[PDB]
Design an enzyme around this catalytic site. Structure first.
Site, short mmCIF file in Angstrom:
data_model
loop_
_atom_site.label_atom_id
_atom_site.label_comp_id
_atom_site.label_asym_id
_atom_site.label_seq_id
_atom_site.Cartn_x
_atom_site.Cartn_y
_atom_site.Cartn_z
N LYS A 174 -35.95 38.87 -25.75
CA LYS A 174 -34.88 38.76 -26.73
C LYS A 174 -35.00 39.83 -27.81
CE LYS A 174 -31.29 36.53 -28.14
NZ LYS A 174 -31.03 37.62 -29.12
N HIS A 230 -29.16 51.81 -13.29
CA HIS A 230 -28.10 50.95 -13.81
C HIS A 230 -28.39 49.47 -13.66
CE1 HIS A 230 -26.09 54.82 -13.10
NE2 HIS A 230 -25.22 54.45 -14.02
N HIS A 236 -18.40 40.57 -11.02
CA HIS A 236 -17.16 39.81 -11.31
C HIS A 236 -17.50 38.33 -11.60
CE1 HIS A 236 -15.02 43.30 -9.91
NE2 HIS A 236 -13.85 42.69 -9.91
N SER A 254 -16.43 33.77 -17.20
CA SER A 254 -16.25 32.35 -16.96
C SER A 254 -17.57 31.70 -16.55
CB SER A 254 -15.20 32.17 -15.87
OG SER A 254 -15.51 32.93 -14.70
N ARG A 256 -9.22 20.52 -15.81
CA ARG A 256 -8.74 20.74 -14.46
C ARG A 256 -9.15 19.65 -13.49
NH1 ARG A 256 -10.43 26.23 -11.42
NH2 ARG A 256 -9.26 27.06 -13.22
N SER A 309 -26.18 36.54 -14.58
CA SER A 309 -26.75 37.83 -14.97
C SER A 309 -27.79 38.23 -13.94
CB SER A 309 -27.38 37.74 -16.36
OG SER A 309 -28.53 36.93 -16.37
N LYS A 352 -26.86 42.65 -7.76
CA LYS A 352 -25.74 43.47 -7.35
C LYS A 352 -26.08 44.94 -7.52
CE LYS A 352 -20.87 44.48 -8.37
NZ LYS A 352 -19.68 44.11 -9.14
N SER A 379 -20.91 45.66 -3.66
CA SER A 379 -20.22 44.49 -4.19
C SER A 379 -20.33 43.37 -3.16
CB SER A 379 -18.76 44.85 -4.47
OG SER A 379 -18.28 45.83 -3.56
N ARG A 388 -28.76 22.38 -7.61
CA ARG A 388 -30.14 22.23 -7.18
C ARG A 388 -31.00 22.01 -8.41
NH1 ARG A 388 -32.83 26.47 -2.98
NH2 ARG A 388 -32.95 27.83 -4.85
#
Lengths: 496, 496, 496
Positions: C121, C190, C204, C208, C260, C376, C382, C388, C454
């Site tokens: 952190k 990266h 992606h 959310s 929802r 993350s 990724k 992707s 899990r």
């Protein structure tokens, strides 16, 4: 009025053919295998062309906020000697072929002064005038970066250096950028580039280097009866009278040291105009005049000469400025017997032929202005030693010197019934000032001298071996090609 | 009594404000962009605070089996000079502030003695007395590891050193642990830390280093008529009389070398009691007494003084022990004219103002105890040189010396019909010894002396410049700030 | 109210002491050597404190030209799991203790969700609102540099991440700065930082993520008859009714997903005021309202509720905002039976005790808002996969799916004279949309749901093992401590 590239290249081929023969018979003809060793001249074919040349195109955000893409290139002629050495030029008249050429010159030049460096050269199509200090910096750094990432700036790969267009400021940035980026872990990061400020790791005596080189280069030959006879020099009345074209750093110092030793400066020309005065010109006066105000024009104690000083009547003419200033045209209109190239390529191949015809000794650029390079070698070493020359010995040496004297004193006093009679323990005035003002620049300066002398002799021996006359140039190139060859030869290529 | 961090800070801000104004006018006002080069003082506000500080908890299995976490820190003040230098402390009194402070001192101290190192300092909250040799090792190694993985130990990055709480043993471990792990591929792995055993790459003449430093420090000023007049020193009958507070390994030597040159020790304190004797005290005798049994108490030829020998009546008082021993209180009660700080922060800022008011020259700790650091620099170099100093010169030099003398002999003989009459070829007794017993420690000790001197003049010239009196302290800090600034300035920060 | 450090430490100790005992007996008491294995709880003593914490002070040249020094720190809690993971915070309130604490939280949080990252952190004492976009950049970079040079930012050392005070724009910079400098040779440069733009190597479904996590966290427990009985939940008329404190990213989504699926939002508070409406509140409406203008105040279809919605009568109360909002004061006044911590530390220890007295299930922050972290992890992967997710499987899968269906169809049509009668080759409407709109986000969101589930069951199992009630918090910590321990244990320390 050829152009750099087709000048150097000629010089090479010249002193390439002249070595080929001898370079087979005598040197290595006692283990001759199928006498196809004459096909080993392919090593000369490899030396001629630059092995690598990198062209770029990086962007920088101008101070106004607008983007702009700067293009530049660095060429590495040879790697026979690991760390490539060569300057960086900021001009809007810097072609790939120019860099390639200069880089070629470097390798040979370094060989001549026994500097373990391969020839390189960099050029950035820019005009310093049109950029702000802040911009310039931004450029040098982004350049350094790209140059790094592709193996064109590294303390063990390629060590750049300043040019008339660049300064120690830039160099300091290059260094720092490197050290604080790709060379962060390199304990010799600051050795990636030379000609940098003292505070940044520069070496005392850089400034005066090139200039002092010119002087010693001339000195060595002006003091050689043999040559000085062919010209009918080393006078008794005339003594020594010289002229310098281009009052830049090199030119200034060249006139300072030359004058200091008895020579008289009769004419000094610049980009603007010139100066004349049979009686003589004093370096400090003309220097303070050019530092006080604009140029050298309107200098008291000196009639404004019109045109180049290349035709002024003197003994030594030193072209310390622009390129190709002596061509086939004005070649036969030169009074001077000795031409000291205090710059690169200030005489064309055609002009060389002429000078030779009318016994004019031209001291090769390839060797004369190799003083800067010689000292840049020291700077490199000084960064590998990570210490300022003489930091650990000055005091020791001083003590040892006084013990030496004291020994002569005590040992001479024991040849008399005294204990303080004889007084040898007293150094001369000069020797005292030396001891008391010992400093790095002294070790440097001395190493320079030594190199310019050794090299000088080397050239002379090579010009007597191949029966050359006053064609010191080709001699030097030959000398160089022999050295570069030896390295390659005593190894190979892929089976090296 | 203010703490170590408040002081050092104050000292900085002091010198920093002194510089600022001259640092702009005269030394850079010639190309003064919108005089906002006053806003360049930001450099100073970057130099003041440490640029990194690593705190760490690491475990070790105590001999008994039980696990225990050990917490320590390492602070790197500046990186203006790549390799950071600093010692490691092993005390249960350490404090992130303390190490930050002492690391701040180091940078400046190095500057003073022209040592290309940044200021660093470590600290491990531990008490050596409560841990077995084995345990202590475990610790120093784990610590080295963690310190390495984060860039706080590295021959190019940071080079630790011993403190009064650590020793060569530890340093040896640090060096080995590093060279056997992270620095396995580093050909200079053993240059990651100094103050190590000789057999591990240490340098000769480390022990006497700090001490000798003290001496030379004093010597340089006690030889300057100018300063010795303001005090009314360099006497004809009182000659020299000094007193040392703290008979450690800096104090002891200090006395030894001071005494060896005509100075008389009249008092020597300790953490127990003291000693007095206006007739003088022999170093060897008091040394052997201390080494033969307990402390210096009960020493024959000396009446047991009571209290601190900081009031004894002498010429030079050298505080070579604890911190803050000279405060506003006892400041006026000193009889000595010169105070040689053989330790760090032995005098408070209040005390300094008093000593100044009653013309008392206080030789800064920032400079006077920099001897050890100066030599540590050599050790580092030794490690990078991969050769013991002199190894390849001593014999060559010897020869050259004899040839020198032989020349004088032969030459002098020529002025007499004899081939053996005059015998200059014989070196003085001293010179002979020197030649016969020529070792590394000689080169080292000489380099030290040369640094102390040059640095001493430098401080004096700075004092005069900023018309400072006997405030050598600020004069030194100013001298330092100037240097550290120059580096930063002649580059920048990001755009450096 | 106790600060974040005090709390997290307490949580640890708590779980630590609960595990010790069991952690010796049944776990490893079979080989029991000397029974001293209890002394192997030293492990735990090593796990508690952060192993490293770097504090810096780096300059930047503000747009106006002035020079400031920025201070900031990064703390790495544990390395048990190679790459450390943690966000960077840009606020004036940041304190070493704060980062240390939050770092501590990470390690455990990651353990809970089975993420192979240590706990880190950062924190930079700076308020984004006082700096220009340009300036912010210049800071993030210079920070990334210093953070790199000391091993606090690499793809295999420490991978930072955004906080509420920093965004993808800053991450992007970090990433780039690193990949352009230090990491230039690192093929995974990266991957040094996460939460970066899609065009910079971002994954992606990041925005959310945290929200969706809070939903699945709640969903997994609100579907467990056992727990829902202890609270008399999973109703047949009241169904579900929730309230969210804080309409930030996490809060908004939390309401969207919750709603929802049958729930009914009856109250939504903010920093300004609140909103209330037993009938319900539609996410999109309230969202558009906030987006369209100002806050949530004045929203139609909703009576402005005064105070904090923490007391609003509902089933699930989700604190998705500021710290310590539920203390020993208002703890009794809550009407909700479930408290979903959609933030870090929104309930004090003393509140926890109360909620546990009056059977109130508090779903731990340590787990509930671990959704962001979980994703993350994916982004990191990724970047290491260099592709992707799905890129080389979507199509293939699609085809396979149709062949499956077309095999049911043909097969069923062979049980009737007809080549086209039965039509099972038609996916559902939902299935078809999924197939036709397959994209990385789907793989991500799924993976997230799988992890939250899990992990949920893991927590439960732990709770039931140690006989904990609705004390899911301690249960989680214990679950974490176990994991972290197992790593250390199945190795050691030095002899690990």
């Amino acid at each position: 009025d050829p152009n750099f590239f087709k000048m150097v290249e000629g010089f090479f081929d010249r002193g390439a053919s002249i070595v080929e023969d001898k370079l087979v018979e005598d040197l290595r003809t006692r283990e001759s295998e199928e006498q196809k060793r004459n096909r080993v001249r392919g090593i000369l074919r490899i030396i001629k062309p630059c092995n690598h040349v990198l062209s770029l195109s990086f962007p920088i955000r101008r101070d106004d906020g607008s983007w702009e893409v700067i293009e530049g290139y660095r060429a590495q002629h040879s790697h026979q000697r690991t760390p490539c050495k060569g300057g960086i030029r900021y001009s809007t008249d810097v072609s790939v072929d120019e860099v390639k050429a200069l880089a070629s010159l470097m390798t040979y030049k370094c060989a001549v002064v026994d500097v373990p460096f391969g020839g390189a050269k960099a050029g950035v199509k820019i005009n310093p005038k049109n950029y702000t200090d802040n911009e310039l910096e931004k450029i040098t750094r982004r350049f350094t970066m790209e140059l790094a990432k592709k193996g064109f700036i590294g303390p063990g790969i390629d060590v750049p250096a300043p040019d008339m267009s660049t300064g120690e400021r830039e160099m300091s940035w290059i260094a720092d950028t490197y050290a604080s980026t790709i060379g962060h872990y390199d304990i010799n990061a600051h050795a990636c580039v030379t000609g940098k400020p003292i505070s940044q790791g520069g070496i005392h005596g850089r400034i005066s280097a090139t200039g002092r080189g010119v002087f010693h280069g001339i000195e060595n030959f002006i003091n050689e009866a043999s040559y000085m006879s062919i010209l009918g020099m080393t006078p008794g009345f005339g003594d020594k009278t010289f002229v310098v074209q281009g009052f830049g750093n090199v030119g200034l110092h060249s006139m300072r040291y030359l004058h200091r030793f008895g020579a008289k400066c009769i004419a000094v020309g610049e980009s603007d105009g010139s100066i004349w005065n049979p009686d003589g010109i004093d370096p400090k006066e003309l220097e303070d005049f050019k530092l006080q105000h604009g140029s050298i024009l309107g200098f008291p104690k000196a009639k404004p000469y019109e045109g180049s000083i290349l035709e002024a009547d003197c003994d030594i003419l030193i072209p310390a400025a622009s390129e190709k200033q002596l061509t086939k045209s004005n070649a036969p209109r030169v009074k001077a017997k000795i031409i000291a190239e205090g710059a690169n390529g200030p005489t064309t191949p055609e002009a060389d032929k002429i000078f030779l015809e009318r016994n004019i000794m031209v001291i090769p650029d390839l060797y004369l202005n190799a003083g800067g390079v010689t000292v840049s070698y020291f700077e490199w070493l000084k960064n590998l030693n990570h210490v300022s020359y003489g930091r650990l010995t000055f005091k020791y040496e001083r003590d040892s010197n006084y013990h030496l004297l004291m020994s002569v004193q005590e040992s001479l006093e024991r040849k008399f019934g005294k204990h303080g009679g004889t007084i040898p323990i007293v150094p001369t005035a000069e020797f005292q000032d030396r001891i008391s003002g010992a400093s790095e620049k002294d070790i440097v300066h001395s190493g320079l001298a030594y190199t310019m002398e050794r090299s000088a002799r080397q050239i002379m021996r090579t010009a007597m071996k191949y029966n050359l006359g006053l064609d010191l140039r080709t001699a030097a190139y030959v000398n160089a090609i022999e050295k570069v060859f030896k390295v390659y030869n005593e190894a190979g290529v892929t089976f090296t």
